[PDB]
Amino acid sequence: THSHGLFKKLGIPGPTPLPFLGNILSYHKGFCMFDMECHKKYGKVWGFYDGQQPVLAITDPDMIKTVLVKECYSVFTNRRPFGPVGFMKSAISIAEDEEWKRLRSLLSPTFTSGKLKEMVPIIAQYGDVLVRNLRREAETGKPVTLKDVFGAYSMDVITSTSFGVNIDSLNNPQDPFVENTKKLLRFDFLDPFFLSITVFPFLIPILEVLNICVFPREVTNFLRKSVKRMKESRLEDVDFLQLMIDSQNSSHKALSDLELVAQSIIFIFAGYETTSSVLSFIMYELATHPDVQQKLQEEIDAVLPNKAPPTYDTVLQMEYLDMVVNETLRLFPIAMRLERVCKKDVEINGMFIPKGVVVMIPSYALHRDPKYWTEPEKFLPERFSKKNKDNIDPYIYTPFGSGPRNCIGMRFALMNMKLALIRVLQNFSFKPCKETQIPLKLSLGGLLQPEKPVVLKVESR
Amino acid sequence: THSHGLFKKLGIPGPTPLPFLGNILSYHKGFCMFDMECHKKYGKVWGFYDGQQPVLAITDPDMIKTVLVKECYSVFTNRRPFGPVGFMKSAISIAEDEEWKRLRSLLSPTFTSGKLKEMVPIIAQYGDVLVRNLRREAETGKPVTLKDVFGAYSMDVITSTSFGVNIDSLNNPQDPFVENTKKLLRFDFLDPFFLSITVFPFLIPILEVLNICVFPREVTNFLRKSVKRMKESRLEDVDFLQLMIDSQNSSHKALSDLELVAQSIIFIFAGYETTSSVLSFIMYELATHPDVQQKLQEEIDAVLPNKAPPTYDTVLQMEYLDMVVNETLRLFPIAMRLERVCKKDVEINGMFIPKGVVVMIPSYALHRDPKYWTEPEKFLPERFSKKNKDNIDPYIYTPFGSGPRNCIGMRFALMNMKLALIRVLQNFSFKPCKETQIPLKLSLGGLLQPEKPVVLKVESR
Numbered sequence: 001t002h003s004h005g006l007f008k009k010l011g012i013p014g015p016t017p018l019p020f021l022g023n024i025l026s027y028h029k030g031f032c033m034f035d036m037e038c039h040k041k042y043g044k045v046w047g048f049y050d051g052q053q054p055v056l057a058i059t060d061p062d063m064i065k066t067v068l069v070k071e072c073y074s075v076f077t078n079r080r081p082f083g084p085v086g087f088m089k090s091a092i093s094i095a096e097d098e099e100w101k102r103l104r105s106l107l108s109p110t111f112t113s114g115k116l117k118e119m120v121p122i123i124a125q126y127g128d129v130l131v132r133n134l135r136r137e138a139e140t141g142k143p144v145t146l147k148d149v150f151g152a153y154s155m156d157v158i159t160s161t162s163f164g165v166n167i168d169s170l171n172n173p174q175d176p177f178v179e180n181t182k183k184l185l186r187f188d189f190l191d192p193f194f195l196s197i198t199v200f201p202f203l204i205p206i207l208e209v210l211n212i213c214v215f216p217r218e219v220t221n222f223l224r225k226s227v228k229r230m231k232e233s234r235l236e237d238v239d240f241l242q243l244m245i246d247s248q249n250s251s252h253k254a255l256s257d258l259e260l261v262a263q264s265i266i267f268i269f270a271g272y273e274t275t276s277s278v279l280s281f282i283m284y285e286l287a288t289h290p291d292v293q294q295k296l297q298e299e300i301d302a303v304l305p306n307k308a309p310p311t312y313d314t315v316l317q318m319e320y321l322d323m324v325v326n327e328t329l330r331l332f333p334i335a336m337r338l339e340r341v342c343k344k345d346v347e348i349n350g351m352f353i354p355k356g357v358v359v360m361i362p363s364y365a366l367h368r369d370p371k372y373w374t375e376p377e378k379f380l381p382e383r384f385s386k387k388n389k390d391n392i393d394p395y396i397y398t399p400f401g402s403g404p405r406n407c408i409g410m411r412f413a414l415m416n417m418k419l420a421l422i423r424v425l426q427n428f429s430f431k432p433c434k435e436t437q438i439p440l441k442l443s444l445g446g447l448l449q450p451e452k453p454v455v456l457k458v459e460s461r
Numbered sequence: 462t463h464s465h466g467l468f469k470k471l472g473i474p475g476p477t478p479l480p481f482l483g484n485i486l487s488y489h490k491g492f493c494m495f496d497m498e499c500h501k502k503y504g505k506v507w508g509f510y511d512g513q514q515p516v517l518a519i520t521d522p523d524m525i526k527t528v529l530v531k532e533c534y535s536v537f538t539n540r541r542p543f544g545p546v547g548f549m550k551s552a553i554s555i556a557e558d559e560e561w562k563r564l565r566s567l568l569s570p571t572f573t574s575g576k577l578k579e580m581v582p583i584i585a586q587y588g589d590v591l592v593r594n595l596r597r598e599a600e601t602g603k604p605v606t607l608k609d610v611f612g613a614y615s616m617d618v619i620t621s622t623s624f625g626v627n628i629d630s631l632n633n634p635q636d637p638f639v640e641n642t643k644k645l646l647r648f649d650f651l652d653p654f655f656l657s658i659t660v661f662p663f664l665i666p667i668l669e670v671l672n673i674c675v676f677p678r679e680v681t682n683f684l685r686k687s688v689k690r691m692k693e694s695r696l697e698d699v700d701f702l703q704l705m706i707d708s709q710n711s712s713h714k715a716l717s718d719l720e721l722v723a724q725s726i727i728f729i730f731a732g733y734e735t736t737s738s739v740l741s742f743i744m745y746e747l748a749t750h751p752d753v754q755q756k757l758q759e760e761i762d763a764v765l766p767n768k769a770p771p772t773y774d775t776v777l778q779m780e781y782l783d784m785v786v787n788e789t790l791r792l793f794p795i796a797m798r799l800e801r802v803c804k805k806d807v808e809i810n811g812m813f814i815p816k817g818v819v820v821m822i823p824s825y826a827l828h829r830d831p832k833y834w835t836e837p838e839k840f841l842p843e844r845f846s847k848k849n850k851d852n853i854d855p856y857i858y859t860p861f862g863s864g865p866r867n868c869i870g871m872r873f874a875l876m877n878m879k880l881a882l883i884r885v886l887q888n889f890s891f892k893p894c895k896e897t898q899i900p901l902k903l904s905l906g907g908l909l910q911p912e913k914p915v916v917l918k919v920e921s922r
């Protein structure tokens with residue numbers, strides 16, 4: 001209890017922390033339930049301790065804007081430190097201060113609307129591959145696991161949009177390029193290892209000196225040389241790798257060869273499990289709400305008659321599709337929390353925040369607050385209609401974060417998931433099965449995923 | 462050898478480092494001899510590794526000025542990190558960046574010429590106490606250990622100038638205020654513990670979590686409450702403590718109660734062993750060079766006839782005394798090295814210095830370089846005469862450092878040591894004894910102290 005008397009001093013309420021452990025024992029229900037309860041007991045501002053690390057939770061929209069937008073470069077610039085990361089310190093997700101701002105600029109033109117429009121035909125090719133693999137399982141007459149069929153699709157999109165490798169991952173399960181990427185899994189920060197790290201942050205320097213890395217050394221070395229071969233096999237003869245090689249041929253230094261591999265890993269970590277997991281939550285909501293699925297199938301057929309292929313402009317034309325995606329992200333924000341580290345003794349919106357405190361934003365908790373959402377736990381896509389989309393605070397609904405350090409691949413993820421939804425709904429309808437978890441239960445761990453895999457009925461139109 | 466290929470890359474020469482150990486095995490001769498040899502093999506710029514910590518040594522005066530003066534606030538602002546320090550992170554010697562610049566401003570008016578002139582009568586009282594204790598050992602007819610008789614004097618000056626406690630430390634060896642201060646000793650950075658810290662910097666966070674501190678917890682707690690009692694016993698009814706209490710009654714926050722104790726400890730650590738050790742080197746040079754001692758005794762009697770007491774203005778009037786002090790500090794710079802941490806990827810005087818490299822200045826080595834000093838190893842006080850003092854580069858002879866992070870107690874130390882020299886030379890002459898080490902040998906460790914204690918003959922005038 002070296003720093004366990006900080007919130008009691010400032011008059012900030014919070015759960016009483018145990019020595020050394022802090023409030024980590026309250027995570028037995030998960031990040032989601034611990035945040036909703038604390039928002040109920042203590043109100044708009046409260047604090048707790050991840051071991052000895054003080055964590056201050058804020059829920060005021062004006063104060064969230066100051067943290068994410070206003071005082072970003074000066075104060076709240078970096079995220080919660082974690083390790084051991086090894087060479088992955090050079091990744092944009094982990095870099096801090098000027099190293100981050102240099103990396104953010106070197107990768108910003110990669111995610112413009114112009115580059116995304118050129119990636120549409122490539123991504124769309126695997127939409128047709130997704131249908132053929134789904135139609136073979138549709139004539140099977142048995143339930144289908146969504147994250148398996150969606151995992152293969154997201155895999156194909158990553159391998160093509162990031163490295164220009166075109167594989168049918170579902171039909172090539174033993175492909176060398178597919179086998180390594182499936183070894184990358186989302187970090188469970190409530191698992192025994194990462195919890196021990198949070199309780200024993202002083203053990204991180206020991207793991208770093210032993211070359212131990214939370215990123216498996218095998219997968220990193222595989223991509224570290226696959227790039228240096230493609231940097232010498234493509235050279236000389238539209239993917240993420242090509243756009244990064246063009247960047248080092250111009251803040252304000254060129255992108256390093258090792259840094260190139262770091263951001264490539266971060267792109268795979270981003271658009272793989274997240275895309276497949278979000279697409280699964282959507283098809284769960286479409287199957288349990290057939291009225292919503294039927295209405296969307298009728299909107300798609302209007303813009304795209306005769307099952308016409310979607311384009312960059314026809315996707316952005318669909319609004320009910322955007323409503324369904326936004327509503328699903330509300331009930332399942334894979335981020336759950338948004339965190340920033342306070343680097344100075346500052347005072348924002350009439351409250352003193354000392355140096356070193358991690359400022360946290362319970363995104364999942366604010367998405368289900370009755371103070372802003374009527375019938376929060378219900379799947380009502382009409383909240384995001386142009387009629388009602390104005391009654392939504394842009395700092396309460398933040399599925400892609402906000403400010404200079406938001407999700408740099410937002411429009412890519414949205415376009416990727418919508419293209420999948422469109423082609424799938426142009427050929428199939430989805431019915432609930434017997435083993436379908438109704439209502440779905442979220443995992444008690446540190447990841448926003450269902451307890452049991454989503455299984456539904458797939459029929460051909 | 463994670464970072465052991467940095468100097469080989471930049472083309473900077475240096476001794477070949479062993480894995481994990483680096484170049485620490487070369488310290489078997491001491492900081493002094495390792496620096497002189499490296500200045501001889503590799504020239505003006507070279508590098509080595511304290512374990513895995515790269516250390517770049519520079520000897521160009523224009524480049525030293527850029528590090529200590531020009532690019533101080535922007536780049537070279539902090540010193541080499543070391544620990545565990547505990548609460549002593551709040552001390553000016555250890556604080557970094559804005560915490561340091563806030564502390565430096567809060568303590569700068571404490572060391573002005575006005576405050577020092579008011580401390581002269583208090584310090585001068587223990588000059589008379591020093592003579593009586595020396596005259597009793599003068600009629601003894603036996604050799605006298607200088608650091609013992611000088612240690613008591615420096616002790617009395619600290620206890621009076623910092624806390625207003627007036628004790629005859631030599632005649633009160635069991636005084637509670639004297640017993641704790643003698644427990645503070647200069648840190649030997651070549652001892653088994655601090656060497657293990659340099660080789661295992663990742664063990665510092667473990668020692669910090671165990672409340673282990675290189676400053677003994679007993680002495681710290683003693684002064685931590687002695688201040689809070691004197692802050693409530695003096696209150697309400699010219700020392701360092703009083704000047705600091707007046708500062709918190711005005712960058713830009715008041716000085717903390719805990720921070721007050723931190724700087725008090727740093728003052729004791731500064732002006733105790735250093736003052737007694739430097740005063741010993743001077744009396745060694747005066748005894749081995751009687752021509753110098755006789756000339757200084759004649760300069761003192763001119764300004765101060767009939768053994769008149771010295772004042773703030775009569776001390777600054779003496780020039781040969783200043784010459785002798787400066788020349789002794791040349792041959793025995795207790796700093797030996799001057800170090801700064803490079804916080805950015807900068808490039809100064811046509812050389813790239815990456816982030817995290819400790820920039821070092823071999824002060825001891827430059828003080829004995831024949832390229833700037835004729836007959837370096839000889840005690841020739843005439844180098845600092847107004848005739849020849851102009852042929853001295855202010856960035857080669859830096860006994861008190863240089864720049865915004867120099868010794869903030871320079872003029873206090875000089876005035877303190879000169880007052881001691883004047884009163885002592887007004888009543889005694891110093892002859893070499895049989896057990897007197899001639900020539901004196903420096904310690905092979907990490908401290909600039911003699912191998913054997915200086916013993917001389919003391920006679921009454």
Ligand code: HEM
Binds near residue numbers: 338339
């Ligand atoms: C449904 C899909 C996705 C969602 C909901 C999502 C959400 C988020 C959120 C909430 C953040 C943190 C924002 C903040 O800290 O304020 C973030 C960061 C980030 N996202 Fe995503 N993301 C998704 C997919 C992707 C994809 C496909 C990419 C492709 C490159 C990507 C790249 C990144 C990066 C690099 C960051 C870190 C940015 C930085 O630290 O500067 N994300 N994402």
Ligand code: HEM
Binds near residue numbers: 727736860875
């Ligand atoms: C013969 C006596 C002394 C010598 C030769 C000496 C020398 C030095 C040197 C070389 C430095 C480092 C300068 C740099 O990094 O560039 C230093 C720092 C310092 N000295 Fe002294 N010193 C002496 C006595 C004292 C005394 C009596 C005090 C009383 C307060 C003192 C207070 C300090 C402090 C606080 C620092 C650190 C300054 C900072 O980090 O901002 N020193 N000293």
Ligand SMILES: O=C(CCc1cccnc1)N[C@H](CS[C@@H](Cc1ccccc1)C(=O)NCCc1cccnc1)Cc1ccccc1
Binds near residue numbers: 050082
């Ligand atoms: O950017 C990516 C990764 C790519 C991505 C994923 C999803 C969406 N967009 C991008 N994570 C970003 C946050 S850093 C992540 C560690 C990481 C993990 C992988 C790579 C780099 C750093 C973390 O939460 N540390 C917290 C440390 C901690 C917590 C509790 C207790 N003790 C320690 C943004 C993000 C995260 C989660 C969802 C959405 C966005």
Ligand SMILES: O=C(CCc1cccnc1)N[C@H](CS[C@@H](Cc1ccccc1)C(=O)NCCc1cccnc1)Cc1ccccc1
Binds near residue numbers: 552735795868
């Ligand atoms: O300011 C004081 C102390 C007071 C003082 C003493 C003498 C003159 N004036 C002031 N030290 C200052 C330097 S920090 C000292 C640690 C310290 C020690 C005590 C308190 C705070 C920090 C250090 O060298 N770390 C290096 C870490 C290291 C080295 C090698 C290998 N691995 C690790 C200035 C100074 C030092 C020496 C002589 C003159 C000035």
